[PDB]
UniProtKB/Swiss-Prot annotation:
Family: Belongs to the SRP19 family.
UniProt-annotated location(s): Cytoplasm
Cellular-component GO terms for this entry: signal recognition particle
Protein name per Swiss-Prot or TrEMBL: Signal recognition particle 19 kDa protein
GO biological process: SRP-dependent cotranslational protein targeting to membrane, signal sequence recognition
Lineage, top ranks: Archaea, Methanobacteriati, Methanobacteriota, Archaeoglobi, Archaeoglobales
Keywords noted in UniProt: Cytoplasm, Ribonucleoprotein, RNA-binding, Signal recognition particle
MF terms (GO), sorted A to Z: 7S RNA binding
Length: 104
C-alpha cells in the first residue's frame, strides 16, 4: 500500500548496470515490452502505474517509466513485478500472432 518507482530499463537484461539494471538475470525480460508492463498491472487492477516523461514530444527516449505500490522492498518487488511481467512476455511466446492467426 505504498509507492515504488521502477523504470522500463531496470527489468531489461539487455540494459547493463550503466543503462540502469535492477532486476536479476534469472527473471529479467530482455527488451522492455509495453504489452507486458501495462497488461501486468491490469491483471491485478492495482499494483503499479506507468508514468511518461514530462514531455512526450521528444525523440531518443526509453519509452516510459513504471511505479509499483509496495515500497519497503527493492529487487524482490522487481522480482514480483517481473513475475507478472514475465507471464505476459511468455504469453507472446505461447502465441505469435501467427499460430492463432490461421485457424485450420
Amino acid at each position: 500500500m505504498k509507492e515504488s518507482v521502477v523504470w522500463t530499463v531496470n527489468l531489461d537484461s539487455k540494459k547493463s548496470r550503466a543503462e540502469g539494471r535492477r532486476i536479476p538475470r534469472r527473471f529479467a525480460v530482455p527488451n522492455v515490452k509495453l504489452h507486458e508492463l501495462v497488461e501486468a498491472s491490469k491483471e491485478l487492477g492495482l499494483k503499479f502505474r506507468a508514468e511518461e516523461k514530462k514531455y512526450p514530444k521528444s525523440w531518443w527516449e526509453e519509452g516510459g517509466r513504471v511505479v509499483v505500490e509496495k515500497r519497503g522492498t527493492k529487487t524482490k518487488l522487481m522480482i514480483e513485478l517481473a513475475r507478472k511481467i514475465a507471464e505476459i512476455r511468455e504469453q507472446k511466446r505461447e502465441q505469435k500472432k501467427d499460430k492463432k492467426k490461421k485457424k485450420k
